[PDB]
Amino acid sequence: MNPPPPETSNPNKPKRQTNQLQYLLRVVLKTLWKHQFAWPFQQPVDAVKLNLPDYYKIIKTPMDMGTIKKRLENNYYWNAQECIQDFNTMFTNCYIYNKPGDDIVLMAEALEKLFLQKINELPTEE
Ligand SMILES: CC(=O)N1CCc2c(sc3nc(SCC(=O)Nc4cccnc4C)n(Cc4ccco4)c(=O)c23)C1
């Protein structure tokens, strides 16, 4: 079975709108989301449909861009670092679970390179 996905809203978790979080949705997430390599990362890993019975025995902090997108759209994050951490968790999980040099890793590596380039250009808080 798959676990429940990571939450994307929480009525008790404070929220605000900041220009850095606006940038993470409009520039960073959008650039990665539309990239030709985005698709394996656009939703939680479906260990059932993908026949990966050991995925959630190895990965206990799953994360994916579908979750990140919803968190941004739902004002789930208070700050940019929370979102950056989620992207990093996504990439790290990929590099832990998959064999080095596999295509999925090369795909993540290409997305991470773009990610780091866009994060280097994070605007200062207004
Ligand atoms: C984010 C992330 O880490 N994941 C989500 C996406 C993903 C995996 S693992 C995986 N395998 C395939 S291939 C079928 C397979 O080999 N399953 C399998 C069975 C028994 C043992 N190990 C394996 C791998 N495909 C389809 C595909 C896309 C390009 C190449 O292949 C995938 O999208 C994924 C994990």
- Residue 12 falls inside a structural domain: no
d(CA 107, CA 83): 20
- 8 is written with which tokens? 């994307």
CB 24 within 8 A of CB 80: yes
d(CA 76, CA 25): 12
- Residue 5 falls inside a structural domain: no
| Helices vs. strands in the chain: H and E counts, helices first | 6, 0
- Residue 105 falls inside a structural domain: yes
Question: What residue ranges line ligand 1, CB within 6 angstroms?
Answer: 40-41, 45, 50-52, 94, 97-98, 103-104
- Residue 48 falls inside a structural domain: yes
CA-nearest residue, atom 24 of ligand 1: 52
Name the residue range of residue 50's domain.
18-122
Contacts (Cβ under 8 Å, ≥6 apart) of 37: 107, 108, 110, 111
Contacts (Cβ under 8 Å, ≥6 apart) of 79: 18, 20, 21
Number of domains observed in the structure of the chain: 1
Contacts (Cβ under 8 Å, ≥6 apart) of 55: 45, 47, 97
φ and ψ at 69, to 5 degrees? -60, -45
Q: How many CA atoms lie within 13 A of 7 on its CB side?
A: 8
- Residue 2 falls inside a structural domain: no
Residue 18 Cα to ligand 1 midpoint, Å, equals: 36
- Residue 42 falls inside a structural domain: yes
- Residue 10 falls inside a structural domain: no
For this PDB entry, the determination method is X-ray
